[PDB]
Amino acid sequence: TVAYIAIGSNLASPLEQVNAALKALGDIPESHILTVSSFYRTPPLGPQDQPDYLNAAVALETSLAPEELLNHTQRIELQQGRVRKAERWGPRTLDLDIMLFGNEVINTERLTVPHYDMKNRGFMLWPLFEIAPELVFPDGEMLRQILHTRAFDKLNKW
């Protein structure tokens, strides 16, 4: 099972955050990073200040529970020393959630299976298109198929 996550960074050197954001997965239990996309500059959506903002997905080949996986990526924000204060919709500093995970559909308290938002955004479909566009939903749709209706080639690199 692959972990399609979306990393963000603004109020803390958008480049520095991503580094320890994708490599930290190497230590995560039952988690083993496989492929890595690149850095794409794009406008965020939330509080913070909406600066340059850097986004980059990553195909984390992990077998860790679908519910605890995202839970792990969350504690990574703490290890990165994020600056919590007003994070409701925008990255603000660092927020890596599960945008796509295998095919299972589970929703706990913190874990969130393919959140109905990435399919209508660009920094979640475009980046994922690199990590693993061969992902398909239980019904019958791939992130590639989603990009067929979306067509989000934006997210101009840093």
From Swiss-Prot:
Question: What reactions does this protein catalyze?
Answer: 6-hydroxymethyl-7,8-dihydropterin + ATP = (7,8-dihydropterin-6-yl)methyl diphosphate + AMP + H(+)
Source organism's superkingdom?
A: Bacteria
Record-given protein name: 2-amino-4-hydroxy-6-hydroxymethyldihydropteridine pyrophosphokinase
Q: Which residues cross the membrane?
A: none
| GO biological process entries | folic acid biosynthetic process; tetrahydrofolate biosynthetic process
Which Pfam families does its entry note? HPPK
The organism is: Escherichia coli (strain K12)
Output the Gene Ontology terms for molecular function.
2-amino-4-hydroxy-6-hydroxymethyldihydropteridine diphosphokinase activity; ATP binding; kinase activity; magnesium ion binding
Q: What does this protein do?
A: Catalyzes the transfer of pyrophosphate from adenosine triphosphate (ATP) to 6-hydroxymethyl-7,8-dihydropterin, an enzymatic step in folate biosynthesis pathway.
